[PDB]
Amino acid sequence: SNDGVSETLLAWRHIDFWTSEHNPDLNATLSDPCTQNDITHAEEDLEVSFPNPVKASFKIHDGQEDLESMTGTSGLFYGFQLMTLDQVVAMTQAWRNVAKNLNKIPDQKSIPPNAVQPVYAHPAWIPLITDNAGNHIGVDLAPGPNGKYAQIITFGRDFDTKFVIAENWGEFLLSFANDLEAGNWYLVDDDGELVFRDKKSNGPIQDYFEVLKRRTWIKYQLER
Amino acid sequence: NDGVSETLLAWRHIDFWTSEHNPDLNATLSDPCTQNDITHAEEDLEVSFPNPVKASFKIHDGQEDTSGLFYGFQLMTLDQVVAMTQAWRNVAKNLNKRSPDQKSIPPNAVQPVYAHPAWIPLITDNAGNHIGVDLAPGPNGKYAQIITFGRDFDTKFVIAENWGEFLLSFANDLEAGNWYLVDDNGDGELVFRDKKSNGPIQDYFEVLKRRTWIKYQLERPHRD
């Protein structure tokens, strides 16, 4: 519907421009668009309908690739990599295998409470971002009773507590773009690796997951 | 179109069975919904009805007097589905503001919650209990699986893989002779009995629960 598509397009305009201004090396990792056929093929494989804002994102960049880099790709989301469609399919399948094996882990929990299913893995959690260490940001196509369909969540190896970080994929991308524009960043030399800091408060370099978690906690508490 | 054929075939059996054995009940089966009626309900609830459920609605818009088709349980009109889903969405909201063990058979197939926005009631016992379609399954569930939920269903049961299989298993019970009419001194109230075992009248919920238990137990030996 009219729920995040516009935000996705606008976000990508800002991120495309910001990166080309401040970090061309990172800009050049942003892959060409997926085709509708690529998307159709992935939807057939996974037996899922991608939400509209997620499809729109894929039709702008099919993730990050960075061919020539012995070290590894530089994540666009403050070190975390935007996954290619092929990576999304492979990882979803991997997580579906985990979910099968768990049927045949400490207490699983949700912020806000009851927004995300209290489980280690679910077939309908589609990973879109990876820390390449077992953790993801993705889209939740089977929310808890106080969740929203296609809400954006954190899950994986180290996410016993899962967080709703955005209402849709568009809002998530836009809040990331706003962090870039507000100056909430530092590049590190070895154009460099992109890390988060809160500029207005002179905040320390922080892991972007911790930032997202704190913001979710705060937003939940203020709305209660 | 998984279950659509089964839906069409089931309705053929039930339409004919009822006209043969219980014309009073036949006459409660409403005219088809229009595509516009369905579109309007989908817009109101912000959901996509599974294909077999849409096909069912385009054959009968529930019952309108009405003593229930499904061994006393009433097939709900589209307007009743919308109203009841909204009612259950209000419950789900009230449980969040402030927050009997909720469980699933099979385990982890249905979310362990009292109410969920994405559980669409299609049948009512007119006492707070439902058979419906589950659009937010647990990690070992299937999208659009058919479940029992409501007032007295602290444990929820997956009774069919889709709405077509459910309707067809009902139609097969009718054809197998698993029924008994009850005349009040009126062609009478339809109740279930197991004909092959010459068994007593049973509540159809208990029958469905027992069949779910049995199916689950027989399948557990198979892991590969």
CSV table of C-alpha atoms in Angstrom, one decimal:
chain,number,residue,atom,x,y,z
A,1,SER,CA,0.0,0.0,0.0
A,2,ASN,CA,1.1,3.7,0.6
A,3,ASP,CA,3.2,2.6,3.6
A,4,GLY,CA,7.0,3.2,3.2
A,5,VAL,CA,7.5,3.2,-0.5
A,6,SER,CA,7.9,7.0,-0.7
A,7,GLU,CA,10.2,7.0,2.3
A,8,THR,CA,12.3,4.2,0.7
A,9,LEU,CA,12.8,6.3,-2.5
A,10,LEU,CA,13.6,9.5,-0.6
A,11,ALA,CA,16.0,7.7,1.8
A,12,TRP,CA,17.9,6.2,-1.2
A,13,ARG,CA,18.2,9.6,-2.8
A,14,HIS,CA,19.8,11.0,0.4
A,15,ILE,CA,22.1,7.9,0.9
A,16,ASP,CA,23.2,7.8,-2.7
A,17,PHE,CA,24.1,11.6,-2.5
A,18,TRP,CA,25.6,11.5,1.0
A,19,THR,CA,27.9,8.6,0.0
A,20,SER,CA,29.0,10.2,-3.3
A,21,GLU,CA,29.9,13.4,-1.3
A,22,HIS,CA,31.6,11.9,1.8
A,23,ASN,CA,32.7,8.3,0.9
A,24,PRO,CA,32.9,7.4,-2.9
A,25,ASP,CA,34.5,4.0,-2.0
A,26,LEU,CA,31.3,3.0,-0.1
A,27,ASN,CA,29.1,4.5,-2.9
A,28,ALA,CA,30.7,2.1,-5.4
A,29,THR,CA,29.7,-0.9,-3.3
A,30,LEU,CA,26.0,-0.2,-4.0
A,31,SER,CA,25.0,-2.7,-6.6
A,32,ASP,CA,22.8,-2.2,-9.7
A,33,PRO,CA,19.0,-2.6,-9.3
A,34,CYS,CA,17.4,-6.1,-9.2
A,35,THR,CA,15.1,-6.8,-12.1
A,36,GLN,CA,11.4,-7.7,-11.5
A,37,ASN,CA,12.4,-11.3,-12.7
A,38,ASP,CA,15.1,-11.5,-10.0
A,39,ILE,CA,12.6,-10.5,-7.4
A,40,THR,CA,9.9,-12.9,-8.7
A,41,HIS,CA,12.5,-15.7,-8.7
A,42,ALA,CA,13.4,-15.0,-5.0
A,43,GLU,CA,9.6,-14.8,-4.1
A,44,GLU,CA,9.0,-18.2,-5.8
A,45,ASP,CA,12.0,-19.8,-4.0
A,46,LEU,CA,11.1,-18.4,-0.5
A,47,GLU,CA,7.3,-18.6,-1.1
A,48,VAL,CA,7.0,-15.1,0.3
A,49,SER,CA,5.6,-11.7,-0.8
A,50,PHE,CA,8.2,-9.0,-0.3
A,51,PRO,CA,6.5,-5.9,1.2
A,52,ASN,CA,6.3,-3.0,-1.3
A,53,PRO,CA,9.0,-0.8,0.4
A,54,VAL,CA,11.5,-3.8,0.4
A,55,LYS,CA,10.8,-4.5,-3.4
A,56,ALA,CA,11.3,-0.8,-4.1
A,57,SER,CA,14.7,-0.8,-2.3
A,58,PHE,CA,15.8,-3.9,-4.2
A,59,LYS,CA,14.8,-2.1,-7.5
A,60,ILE,CA,17.3,0.6,-6.5
A,61,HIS,CA,20.3,-1.4,-5.2
A,62,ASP,CA,20.6,-5.2,-5.0
A,63,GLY,CA,22.8,-4.9,-1.9
A,64,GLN,CA,26.5,-4.3,-1.6
A,65,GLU,CA,29.2,-6.3,-3.4
A,66,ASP,CA,32.7,-4.6,-3.4
A,67,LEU,CA,34.5,-7.1,-5.7
A,68,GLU,CA,38.1,-5.9,-5.1
A,69,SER,CA,38.7,-6.0,-1.4
A,70,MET,CA,40.8,-8.6,0.4
A,71,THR,CA,39.6,-7.3,3.8
A,72,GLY,CA,35.9,-7.5,3.1
A,73,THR,CA,33.0,-5.3,2.2
A,74,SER,CA,32.4,-2.1,4.2
A,75,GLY,CA,28.9,-2.1,5.6
A,76,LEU,CA,26.8,0.8,4.7
A,77,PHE,CA,24.8,0.8,7.9
A,78,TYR,CA,27.8,1.8,10.2
A,79,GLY,CA,29.6,-1.4,9.3
A,80,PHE,CA,26.6,-3.7,8.7
A,81,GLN,CA,26.2,-4.9,5.1
A,82,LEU,CA,23.1,-4.5,3.0
A,83,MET,CA,22.6,-8.1,1.7
A,84,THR,CA,22.2,-8.9,-2.0
A,85,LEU,CA,19.0,-10.7,-3.0
A,86,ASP,CA,20.9,-14.0,-3.4
A,87,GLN,CA,22.3,-13.5,0.1
A,88,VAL,CA,18.7,-12.8,1.4
A,89,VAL,CA,17.5,-16.1,-0.1
A,90,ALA,CA,20.4,-18.2,1.1
A,91,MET,CA,20.3,-16.7,4.6
A,92,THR,CA,16.4,-17.1,4.9
A,93,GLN,CA,16.9,-20.7,3.9
A,94,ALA,CA,19.7,-21.1,6.5
A,95,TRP,CA,17.4,-19.7,9.2
A,96,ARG,CA,14.5,-21.9,8.1
A,97,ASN,CA,16.9,-24.9,8.7
A,98,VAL,CA,17.7,-23.7,12.2
A,99,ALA,CA,13.9,-23.3,12.9
A,100,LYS,CA,13.3,-26.9,11.7
A,101,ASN,CA,16.2,-28.2,13.9
A,102,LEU,CA,14.8,-26.4,17.0
A,103,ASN,CA,11.5,-28.3,16.6
A,104,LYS,CA,13.2,-31.8,16.4
A,105,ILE,CA,18.7,-21.1,23.7
A,106,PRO,CA,17.9,-18.9,26.8
A,107,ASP,CA,14.6,-16.8,27.2
A,108,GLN,CA,13.4,-15.2,23.9
A,109,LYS,CA,11.8,-11.8,24.5
A,110,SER,CA,10.5,-8.7,22.6
A,111,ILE,CA,10.7,-4.9,22.9
A,112,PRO,CA,8.0,-3.7,22.7
A,113,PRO,CA,6.6,-6.8,24.6
A,114,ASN,CA,4.4,-9.1,22.4
A,115,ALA,CA,5.5,-7.2,19.1
A,116,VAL,CA,7.9,-10.0,17.9
A,117,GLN,CA,7.3,-13.7,18.4
A,118,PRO,CA,9.4,-14.9,21.4
A,119,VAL,CA,11.4,-17.5,19.3
A,120,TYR,CA,15.0,-17.9,18.2
A,121,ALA,CA,14.1,-18.3,14.5
A,122,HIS,CA,11.0,-17.9,12.3
A,123,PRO,CA,10.6,-18.8,8.6
A,124,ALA,CA,8.9,-15.4,8.0
A,125,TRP,CA,11.8,-13.2,9.3
A,126,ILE,CA,13.6,-12.0,6.2
A,127,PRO,CA,17.1,-10.8,6.8
A,128,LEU,CA,18.1,-7.6,4.8
A,129,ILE,CA,21.2,-6.6,6.8
A,130,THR,CA,24.0,-8.7,8.3
A,131,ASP,CA,26.9,-8.0,10.7
A,132,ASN,CA,28.4,-11.1,9.1
A,133,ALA,CA,28.6,-12.6,12.6
A,134,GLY,CA,25.1,-14.2,12.9
A,135,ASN,CA,23.0,-11.0,13.5
A,136,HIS,CA,20.5,-9.3,11.2
A,137,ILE,CA,18.1,-6.5,10.6
A,138,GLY,CA,15.2,-7.6,8.6
A,139,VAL,CA,11.4,-7.6,8.0
A,140,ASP,CA,8.9,-9.5,10.1
A,141,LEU,CA,6.1,-11.1,8.1
A,142,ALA,CA,4.6,-12.9,11.2
A,143,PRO,CA,4.4,-10.3,14.0
A,144,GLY,CA,3.3,-10.9,17.6
A,145,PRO,CA,-0.2,-9.7,18.7
A,146,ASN,CA,1.1,-6.1,19.4
A,147,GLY,CA,3.4,-6.0,16.4
A,148,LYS,CA,2.8,-4.7,12.9
A,149,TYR,CA,3.1,-6.7,9.6
A,150,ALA,CA,6.4,-5.9,7.9
A,151,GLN,CA,7.8,-4.1,11.0
A,152,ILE,CA,11.6,-4.0,10.9
A,153,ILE,CA,13.3,-6.1,13.7
A,154,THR,CA,16.7,-7.3,15.0
A,155,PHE,CA,17.3,-11.0,15.2
A,156,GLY,CA,20.1,-13.7,15.1
A,157,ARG,CA,22.8,-15.2,17.2
A,158,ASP,CA,23.0,-12.5,19.9
A,159,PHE,CA,19.4,-11.2,19.9
A,160,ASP,CA,17.7,-13.3,22.6
A,161,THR,CA,15.7,-10.0,23.0
A,162,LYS,CA,14.3,-8.8,19.6
A,163,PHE,CA,13.7,-5.1,19.0
A,164,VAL,CA,11.2,-3.4,16.7
A,165,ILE,CA,13.4,-0.6,15.3
A,166,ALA,CA,11.0,0.7,12.6
A,167,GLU,CA,7.4,0.4,11.4
A,168,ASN,CA,8.4,-0.4,7.8
A,169,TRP,CA,11.6,-0.6,5.7
A,170,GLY,CA,11.1,3.0,4.4
A,171,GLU,CA,11.1,4.5,7.9
A,172,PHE,CA,14.2,2.5,8.8
A,173,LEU,CA,16.2,3.7,5.7
A,174,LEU,CA,15.0,7.3,6.3
A,175,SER,CA,16.1,7.3,10.0
A,176,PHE,CA,19.5,6.0,8.8
A,177,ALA,CA,19.7,8.8,6.1
A,178,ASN,CA,18.7,11.4,8.9
A,179,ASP,CA,21.6,10.1,11.1
A,180,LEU,CA,24.0,10.7,8.1
A,181,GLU,CA,22.6,14.2,7.5
A,182,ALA,CA,22.7,15.2,11.3
A,183,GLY,CA,26.4,14.4,11.3
A,184,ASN,CA,26.2,11.3,13.5
A,185,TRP,CA,29.3,9.7,12.0
A,186,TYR,CA,33.0,9.3,12.0
A,187,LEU,CA,35.3,7.8,9.3
A,188,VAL,CA,38.3,5.8,10.6
A,189,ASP,CA,41.7,5.6,8.7
A,190,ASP,CA,43.8,2.4,8.4
A,191,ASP,CA,38.1,7.2,2.8
A,192,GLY,CA,37.7,4.8,5.8
A,193,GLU,CA,35.2,2.7,7.8
A,194,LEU,CA,31.9,4.4,8.8
A,195,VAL,CA,31.0,4.3,12.5
A,196,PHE,CA,28.3,6.1,14.6
A,197,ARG,CA,28.6,8.8,17.1
A,198,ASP,CA,26.0,11.3,18.5
A,199,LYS,CA,27.4,14.6,17.3
A,200,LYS,CA,25.1,17.1,19.1
A,201,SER,CA,25.9,15.4,22.5
A,202,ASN,CA,29.6,14.8,21.6
A,203,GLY,CA,28.7,11.1,22.1
A,204,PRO,CA,31.4,8.2,21.9
A,205,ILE,CA,31.7,5.9,18.9
A,206,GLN,CA,28.9,3.3,19.5
A,207,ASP,CA,27.8,0.1,17.8
A,208,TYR,CA,24.8,0.9,15.7
A,209,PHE,CA,22.8,-2.1,17.1
A,210,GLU,CA,23.1,-0.6,20.7
A,211,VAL,CA,22.0,2.8,19.3
A,212,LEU,CA,18.9,1.2,17.6
A,213,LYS,CA,18.1,-0.8,20.8
A,214,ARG,CA,18.4,2.3,23.1
A,215,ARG,CA,16.1,4.3,20.7
A,216,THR,CA,13.5,1.4,20.7
A,217,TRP,CA,13.6,1.2,24.5
A,218,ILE,CA,13.1,5.0,24.8
A,219,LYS,CA,10.3,5.2,22.2
A,220,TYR,CA,8.5,2.3,23.9
A,221,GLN,CA,8.7,3.9,27.4
A,222,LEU,CA,7.6,7.4,26.2
A,223,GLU,CA,4.5,5.8,24.3
A,224,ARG,CA,3.4,3.7,27.4
B,1,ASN,CA,-4.6,-22.0,-5.5
B,2,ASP,CA,-3.8,-24.5,-2.7
B,3,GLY,CA,-7.2,-25.7,-1.3
B,4,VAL,CA,-9.3,-23.8,-3.9
B,5,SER,CA,-10.2,-27.1,-5.7
B,6,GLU,CA,-11.0,-28.7,-2.3
B,7,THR,CA,-13.2,-25.7,-1.3
B,8,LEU,CA,-15.2,-25.9,-4.6
B,9,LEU,CA,-15.6,-29.7,-4.2
B,10,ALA,CA,-16.5,-29.5,-0.5
B,11,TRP,CA,-19.2,-26.9,-1.3
B,12,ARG,CA,-20.6,-29.2,-4.0
B,13,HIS,CA,-21.0,-32.0,-1.5
B,14,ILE,CA,-22.4,-29.8,1.3
B,15,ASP,CA,-24.8,-28.0,-1.0
B,16,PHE,CA,-26.2,-31.4,-2.2
B,17,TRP,CA,-26.0,-33.2,1.1
B,18,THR,CA,-28.0,-30.4,2.8
B,19,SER,CA,-30.7,-30.3,0.1
B,20,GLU,CA,-31.1,-34.1,0.4
B,21,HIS,CA,-31.0,-34.5,4.2
B,22,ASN,CA,-31.7,-31.0,5.8
B,23,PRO,CA,-33.5,-28.4,3.5
B,24,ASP,CA,-34.0,-26.1,6.5
B,25,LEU,CA,-30.2,-25.9,6.9
B,26,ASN,CA,-29.7,-25.6,3.1
B,27,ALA,CA,-31.9,-22.5,3.0
B,28,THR,CA,-29.6,-20.8,5.6
B,29,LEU,CA,-26.7,-20.8,3.1
B,30,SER,CA,-26.5,-17.1,1.9
B,31,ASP,CA,-25.9,-15.9,-1.6
B,32,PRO,CA,-22.2,-15.4,-2.8
B,33,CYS,CA,-20.3,-12.3,-1.7
B,34,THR,CA,-19.3,-10.0,-4.6
B,35,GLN,CA,-15.6,-9.2,-5.3
B,36,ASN,CA,-16.4,-5.7,-4.1
B,37,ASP,CA,-17.8,-7.0,-0.7
B,38,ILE,CA,-14.6,-9.0,-0.3
B,39,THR,CA,-12.4,-6.0,-1.4
B,40,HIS,CA,-14.2,-3.8,1.1
B,41,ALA,CA,-13.6,-6.3,4.0
B,42,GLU,CA,-9.9,-6.7,3.0
B,43,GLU,CA,-9.6,-2.9,3.1
B,44,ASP,CA,-11.3,-2.6,6.5
B,45,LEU,CA,-9.2,-5.4,8.1
B,46,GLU,CA,-6.0,-4.6,6.1
B,47,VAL,CA,-5.5,-8.3,5.2
B,48,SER,CA,-5.4,-10.5,2.2
B,49,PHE,CA,-7.9,-13.4,2.5
B,50,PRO,CA,-6.2,-16.7,1.3
B,51,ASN,CA,-7.5,-17.9,-2.1
B,52,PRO,CA,-9.6,-20.9,-0.7
B,53,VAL,CA,-11.3,-18.5,1.8
B,54,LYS,CA,-12.2,-16.0,-1.0
B,55,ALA,CA,-13.5,-18.9,-3.1
B,56,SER,CA,-15.7,-20.0,-0.1
B,57,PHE,CA,-17.1,-16.5,0.3
B,58,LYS,CA,-17.9,-16.3,-3.5
B,59,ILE,CA,-20.1,-19.4,-3.0
B,60,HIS,CA,-21.9,-18.6,0.3
B,61,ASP,CA,-21.6,-15.4,2.4
B,62,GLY,CA,-22.0,-17.5,5.6
B,63,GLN,CA,-25.4,-18.5,7.0
B,64,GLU,CA,-28.4,-16.2,7.8
B,65,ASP,CA,-31.6,-17.4,9.5
B,66,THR,CA,-29.4,-19.8,12.0
B,67,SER,CA,-28.6,-23.2,13.5
B,68,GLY,CA,-25.1,-24.1,12.5
B,69,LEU,CA,-23.9,-26.0,9.5
B,70,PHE,CA,-20.8,-27.4,11.1
B,71,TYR,CA,-22.6,-29.7,13.7
B,72,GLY,CA,-24.1,-26.6,15.4
B,73,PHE,CA,-21.3,-24.1,14.7
B,74,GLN,CA,-22.4,-21.2,12.4
B,75,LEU,CA,-20.5,-20.2,9.2
B,76,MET,CA,-20.1,-16.5,9.7
B,77,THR,CA,-21.2,-13.8,7.1
B,78,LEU,CA,-18.4,-11.5,5.8
B,79,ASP,CA,-19.9,-8.6,8.0
B,80,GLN,CA,-19.7,-11.0,11.0
B,81,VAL,CA,-16.1,-11.9,10.2
B,82,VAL,CA,-15.2,-8.1,10.0
B,83,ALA,CA,-17.0,-7.3,13.3
B,84,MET,CA,-15.6,-10.3,15.2
B,85,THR,CA,-12.0,-9.7,14.0
B,86,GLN,CA,-12.4,-6.1,15.1
B,87,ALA,CA,-13.7,-7.3,18.5
B,88,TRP,CA,-10.7,-9.7,18.9
B,89,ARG,CA,-8.3,-6.8,17.9
B,90,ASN,CA,-9.8,-4.7,20.8
B,91,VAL,CA,-9.1,-7.6,23.2
B,92,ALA,CA,-5.5,-7.9,21.9
B,93,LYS,CA,-5.0,-4.2,22.4
B,94,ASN,CA,-6.3,-4.3,26.0
B,95,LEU,CA,-4.0,-7.2,26.9
B,96,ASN,CA,-1.0,-5.1,25.8
B,97,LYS,CA,-1.9,-2.1,28.0
B,98,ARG,CA,-1.7,-4.4,31.1
B,99,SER,CA,1.3,-6.8,30.3
B,100,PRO,CA,-4.0,-19.2,32.0
B,101,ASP,CA,-1.0,-20.6,30.0
B,102,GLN,CA,-1.6,-20.3,26.2
B,103,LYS,CA,-0.3,-23.3,24.2
B,104,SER,CA,-0.4,-24.9,20.7
B,105,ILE,CA,-0.9,-28.3,19.2
B,106,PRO,CA,1.3,-29.0,17.4
B,107,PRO,CA,3.8,-27.1,19.6
B,108,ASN,CA,5.0,-23.8,18.1
B,109,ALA,CA,2.5,-24.0,15.2
B,110,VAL,CA,0.2,-21.3,16.6
B,111,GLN,CA,1.4,-18.2,18.6
B,112,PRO,CA,0.9,-18.9,22.3
B,113,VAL,CA,-1.5,-15.9,22.9
B,114,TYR,CA,-5.1,-15.4,23.8
B,115,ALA,CA,-5.8,-13.1,20.8
B,116,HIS,CA,-4.0,-12.1,17.6
B,117,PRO,CA,-5.0,-9.4,15.0
B,118,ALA,CA,-4.2,-11.9,12.1
B,119,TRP,CA,-6.5,-14.7,13.3
B,120,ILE,CA,-9.6,-14.4,11.1
B,121,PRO,CA,-12.7,-16.2,12.6
B,122,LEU,CA,-14.8,-18.0,9.9
B,123,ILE,CA,-16.9,-20.2,12.2
B,124,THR,CA,-18.4,-19.4,15.6
B,125,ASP,CA,-20.1,-21.6,18.3
B,126,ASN,CA,-21.8,-18.3,19.3
B,127,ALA,CA,-20.2,-18.8,22.8
B,128,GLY,CA,-16.8,-17.0,22.1
B,129,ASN,CA,-15.0,-19.9,20.3
B,130,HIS,CA,-14.0,-20.0,16.6
B,131,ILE,CA,-12.5,-21.9,13.8
B,132,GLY,CA,-10.5,-19.5,11.6
B,133,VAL,CA,-7.5,-18.9,9.4
B,134,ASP,CA,-4.1,-18.0,10.9
B,135,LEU,CA,-2.3,-15.4,8.9
B,136,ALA,CA,0.6,-15.1,11.5
B,137,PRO,CA,1.7,-18.7,12.3
B,138,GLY,CA,4.3,-19.8,14.8
B,139,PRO,CA,7.7,-21.0,13.6
B,140,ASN,CA,6.4,-24.6,13.0
B,141,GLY,CA,3.1,-23.4,11.6
B,142,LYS,CA,1.9,-22.8,8.0
B,143,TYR,CA,0.6,-19.5,6.7
B,144,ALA,CA,-3.3,-19.8,6.4
B,145,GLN,CA,-3.4,-23.0,8.4
B,146,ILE,CA,-6.8,-23.4,10.0
B,147,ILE,CA,-6.9,-23.2,13.8
B,148,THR,CA,-9.3,-23.2,16.8
B,149,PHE,CA,-9.2,-20.1,19.1
B,150,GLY,CA,-11.4,-18.1,21.5
B,151,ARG,CA,-12.8,-17.9,25.0
B,152,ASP,CA,-12.2,-21.6,25.9
B,153,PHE,CA,-9.1,-22.4,23.7
B,154,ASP,CA,-6.2,-21.8,26.0
B,155,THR,CA,-4.7,-24.5,23.9
B,156,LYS,CA,-5.0,-23.8,20.2
B,157,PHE,CA,-5.2,-26.6,17.6
B,158,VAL,CA,-4.2,-26.7,13.9
B,159,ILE,CA,-7.1,-28.7,12.5
B,160,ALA,CA,-6.2,-28.3,8.7
B,161,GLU,CA,-3.4,-27.1,6.4
B,162,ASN,CA,-5.9,-24.8,4.5
B,163,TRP,CA,-9.6,-23.8,4.4
B,164,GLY,CA,-10.3,-26.2,1.5
B,165,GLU,CA,-8.9,-29.2,3.4
B,166,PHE,CA,-11.0,-28.3,6.4
B,167,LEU,CA,-14.2,-27.9,4.4
B,168,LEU,CA,-13.5,-31.2,2.6
B,169,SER,CA,-12.9,-33.1,5.8
B,170,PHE,CA,-16.3,-31.8,7.1
B,171,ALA,CA,-17.9,-32.8,3.8
B,172,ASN,CA,-16.3,-36.3,4.1
B,173,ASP,CA,-17.8,-36.7,7.6
B,174,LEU,CA,-21.3,-35.9,6.2
B,175,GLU,CA,-20.8,-38.5,3.3
B,176,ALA,CA,-19.3,-41.2,5.7
B,177,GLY,CA,-22.6,-41.0,7.7
B,178,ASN,CA,-21.0,-39.4,10.8
B,179,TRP,CA,-24.2,-37.5,11.8
B,180,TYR,CA,-27.4,-37.7,13.5
B,181,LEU,CA,-30.4,-35.4,13.2
B,182,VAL,CA,-32.3,-34.2,16.2
B,183,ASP,CA,-36.0,-33.3,15.8
B,184,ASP,CA,-37.7,-31.2,18.4
B,185,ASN,CA,-41.1,-32.8,18.7
B,186,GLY,CA,-38.3,-28.7,11.8
B,187,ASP,CA,-35.9,-31.1,10.1
B,188,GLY,CA,-33.7,-30.8,13.2
B,189,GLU,CA,-30.2,-30.0,14.6
B,190,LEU,CA,-27.2,-31.6,13.0
B,191,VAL,CA,-24.8,-33.3,15.5
B,192,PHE,CA,-21.8,-35.6,15.1
B,193,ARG,CA,-21.4,-39.3,15.8
B,194,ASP,CA,-18.8,-41.8,14.6
B,195,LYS,CA,-20.9,-44.3,12.5
B,196,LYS,CA,-18.2,-47.0,12.0
B,197,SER,CA,-17.8,-47.3,15.8
B,198,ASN,CA,-21.6,-46.9,16.5
B,199,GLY,CA,-20.3,-44.2,19.0
B,200,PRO,CA,-22.3,-41.6,21.0
B,201,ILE,CA,-23.0,-38.0,19.9
B,202,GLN,CA,-19.8,-35.9,20.3
B,203,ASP,CA,-19.2,-32.2,20.3
B,204,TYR,CA,-17.4,-31.4,16.9
B,205,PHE,CA,-14.7,-29.4,18.7
B,206,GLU,CA,-13.6,-32.4,20.7
B,207,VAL,CA,-13.6,-34.5,17.5
B,208,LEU,CA,-11.4,-31.9,15.8
B,209,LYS,CA,-9.0,-31.7,18.8
B,210,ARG,CA,-8.7,-35.5,19.0
B,211,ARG,CA,-8.0,-35.8,15.3
B,212,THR,CA,-5.3,-33.1,15.6
B,213,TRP,CA,-3.7,-35.0,18.5
B,214,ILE,CA,-3.9,-38.3,16.6
B,215,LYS,CA,-2.4,-36.8,13.4
B,216,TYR,CA,0.4,-35.2,15.4
B,217,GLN,CA,1.3,-38.4,17.3
B,218,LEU,CA,1.3,-40.6,14.1
B,219,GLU,CA,3.6,-38.1,12.3
B,220,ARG,CA,6.1,-37.6,15.3
B,221,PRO,CA,8.1,-40.9,14.5
B,222,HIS,CA,9.1,-39.3,11.1
B,223,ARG,CA,12.0,-36.8,11.4
B,224,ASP,CA,13.7,-37.9,8.1
